[PDB]
Design a protein around this nucleic acid. Sequence first.
RNA 1: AAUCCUGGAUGGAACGA
RNA 2: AGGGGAUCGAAGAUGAUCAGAUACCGUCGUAGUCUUAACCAUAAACUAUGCCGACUAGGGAUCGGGUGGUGUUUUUUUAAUGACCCACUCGGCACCUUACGAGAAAUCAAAGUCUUUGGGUUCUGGGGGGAGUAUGGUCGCAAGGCUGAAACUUAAAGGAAUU
Lengths: 96, 129, 125, 81, 97, 220, 219, 87, 25
Amino acid sequence: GKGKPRGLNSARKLRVHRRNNRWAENNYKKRLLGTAFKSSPFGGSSHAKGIVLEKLGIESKQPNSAIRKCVRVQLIKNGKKVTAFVPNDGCLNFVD
Amino acid sequence: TRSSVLADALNAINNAEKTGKRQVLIRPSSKVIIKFLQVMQKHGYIGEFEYIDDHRSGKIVVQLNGRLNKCGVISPRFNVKIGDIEKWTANLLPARQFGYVILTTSAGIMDHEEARRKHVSGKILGFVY
Amino acid sequence: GRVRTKTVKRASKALIERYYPKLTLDFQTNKRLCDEIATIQSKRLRNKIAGYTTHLMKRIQKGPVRGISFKLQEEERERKDQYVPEVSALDLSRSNGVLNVDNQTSDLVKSLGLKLPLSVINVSA
Amino acid sequence: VLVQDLLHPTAASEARKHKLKTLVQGPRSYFLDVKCPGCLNITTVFSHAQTAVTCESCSTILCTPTGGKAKLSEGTSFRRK
Amino acid sequence: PKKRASNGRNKKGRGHVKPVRCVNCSKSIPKDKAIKRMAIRNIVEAAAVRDLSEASVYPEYALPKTYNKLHYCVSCAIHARIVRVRSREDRKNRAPP
Amino acid sequence: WVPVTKLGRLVKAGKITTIEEIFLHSLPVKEFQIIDTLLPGLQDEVMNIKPVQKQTRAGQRTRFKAVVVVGDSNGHVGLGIKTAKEVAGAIRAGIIIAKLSVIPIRRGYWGTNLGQPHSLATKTTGKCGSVTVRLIPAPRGSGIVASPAVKKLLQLAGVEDVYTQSNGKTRTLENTLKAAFVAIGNTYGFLTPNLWAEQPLPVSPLDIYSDEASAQKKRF
Amino acid sequence: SLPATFDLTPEDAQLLLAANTHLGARNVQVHQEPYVFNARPDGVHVINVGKTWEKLVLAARIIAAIPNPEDVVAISSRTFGQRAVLKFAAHTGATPIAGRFTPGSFTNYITRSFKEPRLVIVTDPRSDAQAIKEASYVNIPVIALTDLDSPSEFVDVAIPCNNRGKHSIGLIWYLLAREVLRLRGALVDRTQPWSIMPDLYFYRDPEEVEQQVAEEATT
Amino acid sequence: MENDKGQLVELYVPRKCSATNRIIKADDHASVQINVAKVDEEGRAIPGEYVTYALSGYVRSRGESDDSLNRLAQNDGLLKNVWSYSR
Amino acid sequence: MRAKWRKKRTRRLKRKRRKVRARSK
RNA sequence: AAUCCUGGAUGGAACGA
RNA sequence: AGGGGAUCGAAGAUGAUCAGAUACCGUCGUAGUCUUAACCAUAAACUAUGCCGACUAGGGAUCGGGUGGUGUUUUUUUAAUGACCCACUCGGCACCUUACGAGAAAUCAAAGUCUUUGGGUUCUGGGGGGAGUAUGGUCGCAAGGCUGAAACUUAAAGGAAUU
Ligand SMILES: [Zn+2]
C-alpha cells in the first residue's frame, strides 16, 4: 500500500516524516543549521574585503600542469586567512 | 481484513476487463457497490448484474461488455467542495468530454455532472472510464 | 586431407540430377562425358567432379541417396505414392463386421449417433 | 473461460468444490435416523458427531468419533433424514 | 546525509541444516549444498575377479561390494568430480547424466 | 519496381488508394514503395546520429546509429532507427524503416467541437526503457509543450496543441522517441464512447480482388 | 444454419471410431479443451466425435470461403501427416509444406520458400510451433488438429482428435478434403461417398514399402 | 469524431474484436479476421457471401480464440452443439 | 582494505583512545 | 547347441610495473 | 563462576617450503569446543524481497487432514481397518512452462493488478568519501551495543548487461 499512510487523519505522521527526512538534502541542512554564519569566511555574504598577506603559486591538479598565481588574504571582519585566485593574465603584478 | 469492499470489487472488475472476460464475481456486496454499479450501468459501462442473497453479506455477478477501460477507487474518500471537482477531474480523467468521477453526497452517490446540476458536493469515491 | 569441396559436390549433384540416364560407373567415361557436357575450366576439377559423380552413382546403385532426385526416382515414387489396398483397415470385414468399443464409447454413440454395429469389452489397468 | 454462467453452474462442478467456495455456502453434512438390532427406537445422529452417542434404551455404542464422518458401529439400520 | 556501499543478491536457503565435512579437504559444508555421490564398487577390480574366482573355495563365492557415500565441497568437486562447469542455460538442468 | 507482397501488386495496380484500408485490416507492410506511392507528401527528419563502438582484438568497429522520423502533418508518422558503418547509409535505411513503420494518430479536441481537430483525444502514455512520455491534450494556442525532439515528431504528426510530461532518463533519444511513438500509437487503442457503435466488419481487399492481382507466371 | 444433410452419418462415425480418433490424452487435458466425454477408466479421456465433426465442417466452410485455393497452406512436420497433406493438396488446390518449415516463409520476402497465405492448417501445433508463430507475426488464421493435451495458443479453430496414430490424422485430413470438395465441388453430397479410399493417406512405413516392392516383384 | 457541422472527422474508424469488443489497431499483427462461408441447399458454399469474425492478438495469445469462435458461431447459428454457457 | 579488518583497526584504536582518555579523567 | 557378470583418483615453486 | 575436559583446536611452540613466511602444509597444544547458573544481543541473523487483505495464467508432483469410489492387496478366498490406486478438496514447503503484464536489466505468479499514478499499515534511504567515525547520553563486568554529527574533500562512485 505504498508504505506511507493514506488515511484521512494521518497528516501528523506525514508532516513529521517530512520534517525528519528533509535533513538529507544539503541545502535544507545548510539553511537551517546555519553554516554560512558559523563556518564559511564570508558570513553568508557575497563579497568580502581582505588584506593581502602573500602571493602564491599553486600548482594545478592533474592532468593539467600550470601555476595559478593566487594570494593569501586576511579578512577584515573575521581575521580568517584565505586563498584567492587572481585571474586574467598578469594582475599578480597589479596586486602587491 | 478487508478495508474497502469497493476497492476489492473494482480491482476485480478492472482485472477481468484487462483479461477480456465478460463476467466477474465479487464478494462481499454493499449498498455502495450497488449504487456505484448502477451509475456505471446508467452510463453504459457495464451490463446487468445480479445480487446473490446468501444470508451473510452478499455476492454480485456483473456482466460486463468491454466498454470499460478503468474503474477505480479513491481511498481515502476525501472531502470535495464544488471548486475542487475541476481539479479532480483534470487529474484523474483522460479527457474533458467523457469519463465520470463518482462521489457521495447528501443527495446520493452520483457522477460529478449530476452533482454540478444538483449543485452539491461531498465525498469522493472513484472514477470510471 | 582429401575432403571434396562444395563446388565439386554441387556440380556432381546437378549432373546426377539431370544426366542420370548416362554416366556409367566408370571414372573414364564419366570424365569424357564431363568434357562433353560441362564448361569446366580445368582438367583437375573435371576429374574431381567425375570421381564424385562415380562415388554417388555407386552409392545410388546400392540404395537411394538423400539430396538427389533425377526424375526417374521421382516418377518411381509417384508410381508408388498411392496404395489403395484390396480392402481398408476401416471396413470391419477385415474384422468381424462389428466394432469392439468400450462402455464410454457406447455411451457416446447412444448420445449422438444412431444404429451402429458394436460389441463391448471392459479393459482396465 | 472468458464467458460462463457463474449463477447456474453444473451440480458436478459445484459438488466437488469446497463447501464455503460454492455460490452459496452450506453444509455437506447430514443427519441419520439410527436403530440398533436390539431396540426399535430411532436415534438422531449427526454424521460428524464428536461424541460416543448412545442409544438411550440399550446403553450401547452407536458411533465413534473420527476426524470427519463418525464411524458407525457394527451392522445397524441407518437412514439419511 | 548517511552514506553506504555495496550489497548483494540471493539463493533459496533454508533455516538451518547441520554441516558435514568434505571427504578430501575436511571443509564444513551444509548438506543441502554438499555435492553428494555414492561409490558402489566391487572390492576387486574387474580383472582380478578371474584370478580370485580361480583361487577361491566356495563356488560363486559372493563377490560383495563396498558402498560409501561421498560428500564433496564445491572446490574439491570442481577440481576432481564430474560437476565441471556449465553455461547459463545448461546450468538450469538438473538431471544426472 | 516489380513488386511482391500482394499489397504491392494491388498498389501498383492502383486499386488500394488510401492507407486507411491497410490500417483498418491491420495489413503488414513489407515494402516502403507502397506508402511512398500512397503518401507522396511524406517528409523526413534526422533527429540524431550517434556512434556505437564494438571492441575487437585490433581496435573498435565504430558504426553510426541514425534516428529518423518521417511524417506528413496529417496524422501519420513513422520512426526508424538504423545502425550502419556509414552515416548516409544509416540515414537511407532508417528512412526506409521509418516509412515501413507508419502508424495513424487520433488527433481530437480538448474541450469542444469546432473544425479540424488540433490536439490528442486522450491522455496517453508510452514507455521504452526508463523513459515514460505522457501526452496530455491542450487547448488551442498552447502549442506543443515538449522538448525539441518530441516537438518535431508531433509536428510531423500534425498535432497542433499538446502538453507533455516526461519521466526517466530523457537524455537518450531512442527511448524517448520510442515512448512518444508508442503513446501516439496508443491513441487509437482506447475505447471512447463515440467508438461504441458496432460496425459490420468490412471485407479485406486482399480477399475481394485476389485473382485480380495475385502472383501469376508470364512464362513468355 | 447448416441443413440436416451435413450431419454425422453412421458410416463416418464407424470410420472415426475405427481410426480411434475419440481416444484422448493419458497425461493431461488442458483446460481450454472441454471436448471430453466421461473419461475412460484406467487411462485416457474420450472425445466428443460430434463436436469433432462440427468443428471439421466449420474448418471446411472456411477453406471453401478462401477464394484462391493456392492461398491455403497445409503444414506437417510429423511423418504421419506428410502423405496426408500431399494428397490433400493434390485433391484440393492447396499448397503443402511437409518436413521442415524453413523459418521465414510467411514473413521473409526474397527467400524462395515465401508464401503469403490466407489460411494455415497444422497437424500438431507443438511440433509445428514455428508456423503458428509466423502466422501470428503476419496476420494469418490457423486450423489445428489438436489433441486434448496440445497448446491452444495462437490457434484458431481446433479440431479435437488423436495425433498419436496414423489413422486418426490421415482420416481427419480425408474428411476435411471430402467436405471442402463436397462444397464448391462437382460432387453432390449424400449418395456419393467419394470413391477415394482413406488409405491413400495413412503414412506407409518403409518396411511395408519393401513388402509391396516384394509384391510387385512376385506378380 | 464529429465536429460541430456534422461532417465526420477521425479517419480510420477501427475494427473491434468481437470476443472482447476491443479495438484492433494497425500494428496488431496477431489479429485475425476469420471468414466463414454461407451455404445453401446442394452444399455449394456461395462464393462471395461471408460470415465474418474478427479476433485480437490478446485472445489468440492467451489461447481462447477457439472457445470464442465456438460461442460466436453457435449463437450466429451454424452449430447446435459444442458451446455450453455453464462450464 | 577488507572492511572486517578496517573495523577491527578502528576498534583497537577506539579502546586505545578510551584508555588514553581515562589517564586524564 | 554350449554359455554366470563387471569400469576408476588426486600430485610442489611462479613477486613487481 | 562451578563441574567436566575424549576430540578438534584462536594463542603459542615447532618441522618444512620460501628472497623472506613469526602464512598456507605438517606435528604438539592453552583458552575454547560440552554442561549448570548467570551476562552479552550481534551475524551475508539472506526468500539483503516488512505484515495484513483481494484479484489475476497454465501444469504436475509432494507433506498433513478430510470426502467419495461395486477400485488393488493383506488378511479369515470373500469382512472392517492398515498400506496403496483413481477423482476431488482445504492448508503448507516448493517446482516446471509462459509473459496478458512488470522491470534498467538480471529476472519476477510476484518484484504483476503503478503517469489508465490512491486496499490498510510500520520501518528505512536521498551522490561518493570522511563515518558508523568524534562527542554526549544510555545499557553492559568487560569486550562492546544502541543512539549518532561536523569540519574537510570529491565528479564521479555504483547497478545490470554487451563485445
Ligand atoms: Zn573439499
